[PDB]
Amino acid sequence: HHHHHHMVHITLDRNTANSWLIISKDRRQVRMGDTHQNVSDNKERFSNYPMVLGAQRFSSGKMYWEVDVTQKEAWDLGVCRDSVQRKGQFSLSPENGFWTIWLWQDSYEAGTSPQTTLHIQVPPCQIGIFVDYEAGVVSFYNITDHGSLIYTFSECVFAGPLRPFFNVGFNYSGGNAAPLKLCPL
Numbered sequence: 001h002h003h004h005h006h007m008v009h010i011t012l013d014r015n016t017a018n019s020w021l022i023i024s025k026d027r028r029q030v031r032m033g034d035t036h037q038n039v040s041d042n043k044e045r046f047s048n049y050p051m052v053l054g055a056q057r058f059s060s061g062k063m064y065w066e067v068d069v070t071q072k073e074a075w076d077l078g079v080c081r082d083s084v085q086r087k088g089q090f091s092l093s094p095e096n097g098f099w100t101i102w103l104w105q106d107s108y109e110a111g112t113s114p115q116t117t118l119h120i121q122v123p124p125c126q127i128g129i130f131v132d133y134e135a136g137v138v139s140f141y142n143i144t145d146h147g148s149l150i151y152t153f154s155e156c157v158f159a160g161p162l163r164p165f166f167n168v169g170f171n172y173s174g175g176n177a178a179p180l181k182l183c184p185l
């Protein structure tokens with residue numbers, strides 16, 4: 001793909017983070033702590049899941065960023081509406097304001113309703129995410145496999161400002177402690 005020139009510098013918004021997350025000083029990395037991180041509660045924080053938003057809000061244009069997922073067993077990545085539900089249980093679907101893919105139990109799926117099986121021959125260590133606001137498109141690329149397409153959501157109805165979306169996953173297995181990292185331009 002040739003989306004690299006729409007690169008944006010994403011940073012994580014501490015105030016949205018689940019209270020078990022540890023965000024690095026540079027706000028470019030996040031990992032599961034395996035305990036409460038000694039922060040106050042607020043209405044922005046995702047309560048049920050180890051999720052956080054990027055600080056940046058997008059309402060126009062084309063945006064691209066990359067995320068490192070090396071050695072993780074489970075994660076969700078994509079974009080979401082600024083107005084998504086923060087408290088209680090919910091599914092990742094466009095109807096709920098999310099445009100995501102995930103890894104879970106050695107398989108990759110797109111967050112449609114119901115979910116869609118992805119076909120990945122080379123397990124990715126870094127994922128590229130492209131958003132074209134006007135076109136209603138969110139696309140995912142396998143940087144480890146020369147930038148091959150993973151999935152395209154089209155006819156998206158964003159219905160509001162968009163924010164980068166991250167889930168580091170639980171670490172019940174002791175095999176999923178590795179961070180999500182925003183990769184340099």
Ligand SMILES: C[C@@H](O)c1cnn(C2CCCC2)c1
Pocket residue numbers: 018019020047048049050
């Ligand atoms: C995501 C965070 O808010 C959360 C949800 N559940 N848990 C732990 C309670 C027992 C082990 C897992 C932590």
